[PDB]
Amino acid sequence: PLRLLSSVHYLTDGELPQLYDYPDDGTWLRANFISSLDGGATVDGTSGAMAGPGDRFVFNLLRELADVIVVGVGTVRIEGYSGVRMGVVQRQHRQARGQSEVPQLAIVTRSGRLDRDMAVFTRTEMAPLVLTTTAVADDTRQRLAGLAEVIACSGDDPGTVDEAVLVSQLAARGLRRILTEGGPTLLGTFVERDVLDELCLTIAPYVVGGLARRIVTGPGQVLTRMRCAHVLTDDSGYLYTRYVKT
């Protein structure tokens, strides 16, 4: 029943994006996270310490393929969260794929409490989207006029975000190829409401002890079965995996 894996195939620079192709139609919510061997998501608050050149490469490539990046407000506040920086060649490939110069950025909040002076608003080329509830949308739209387009993503309850609606709200705006990179609360909701189509997980060859939290936090408890689509590796021992529901 058991089969041993090993490096069978070197990936040319055009084969690697075909592995991470989005579906030709429909909407698709992809998660990219990185994790240690013992399920540690962070090393002293950062996740950048476990990320080597390999992971970074896949990380930027995934950004290059996305119409939009969804991020929770907690992650966006953290020390050195930039605006999405597309290099000159990345912008080229995106144009050849008919996408815009840079992927759009969507910030999720239930509270609507974002500042006019946040890092995310200030040095991003293009004005980010704010995904929040019906309850707070209008006041948030006012408080951030000229910084962000504020979009209500409530379903049946005006006091919260319905994650399936969030996703549909993005598709509505031609932003059907979605990517999320954190934080663990947002991913938590995406998993609990079962709207996560695909998980891209980097397994860093480290153990970090028991202090770090997982790539997912929250009260949720589910058993979502996924299919292994591929596993990649480099000389440093990392595993770059792709899993699809169901």
Ligand X SMILES: CCc1nc(N)nc(N)c1C#C[C@H](C)c1cc(-c2ccncc2)ccc1OC
Residue whose CB is less far from ligand NDP, 47 or 99: 47
109 annotated binding-site participant:
yes
* Residue with smallest beta-carbon separation from ligand X: 34
Q: Per the annotation, does 45 bind a ligand?
A: yes
What would the two tokens of residue 121 be? 């608003």
Note whether 233 binds ligand NDP by CB under 6 A: no
How many chain residues bind ligand NDP (CB under 6 A)?
27
Query: Which of ligand X, ligand NDP, none lies near 218, with the C-beta cut-off 5 to 8 A by kind?
Result: none
Which H, E and C letters describe 128-145, residue by residue? CEEEECHHHHHHHHHHCC
Any binding-site annotation on 189? yes
Structure tokens at 214: 């997982």
Q: Is 127 annotated as a binding residue?
A: no
Could you tell me if 130 and 107 are in contact, meaning their C-beta atoms sit under 8 angstroms apart? yes
Q: What sign does the CA torsion over 11, 17, 22, 24 have?
A: negative
Tell me: does residue 62 bind ligand NDP (CB under 6 A): no
Q: Candidates 67, 162, 163, 181: give the one binding ligand X (CB under 6 A).
A: 181
Residues with Cβ within 8 Å of 201's Cβ and at least 6 positions away in sequence, in order, are: 32, 33, 34, 35, 215, 241, 243
Among candidates 76, 140, 70, 146, which has minimal Cα distance to 110?
A: 140
DSSP string of 173-203, one letter each residue: TT--EEEE---HHHHHHHHHTT---EEEEEE
217 makes contact with ligand NDP (CB under 6 A):
yes
Residues 6+ apart with CB under 8 A from 122: none
Q: Which is nearer to ligand NDP, 90 or 109 (CB)?
A: 109
Q: Does 216 bind ligand X (CB under 6 A)?
A: no
Binder of ligand X out of 20, 29, 34, 179 (CB under 6 A)? 34
Check residue 113 for interaction with ligand NDP (CB under 6 A). yes
In 3D space, the residue among 80, 75, 105 whose CA is nearest the CA of residue 185 turns out to be 75
Residue 82 or 142: the one with the smaller Cβ distance to ligand X is 82
**CB-nearer residue toward ligand X: 165 or 195:** 195
Binding string, residues 38-67; x marks residues near ligand X by CB under 6 A: ---------xx--x---xx--x--------
Residue 21's Cβ-count burial label (10 Å; 0-12, 13-18, 19+) is exposed
Residues in contact with ligand X by the rule CB under 6 A: 32-34, 47-48, 51, 55-56, 59, 75, 78, 80-81, 181-182, 202
Annotated binding site for NADPH: 34, 41, 45, 47, 73-75, 109-111, 163, 183, 185-186, 189, 213
Annotated binding site for NADP(+): 34, 41, 45, 73-75, 79, 109-111, 163, 183, 185-186, 189
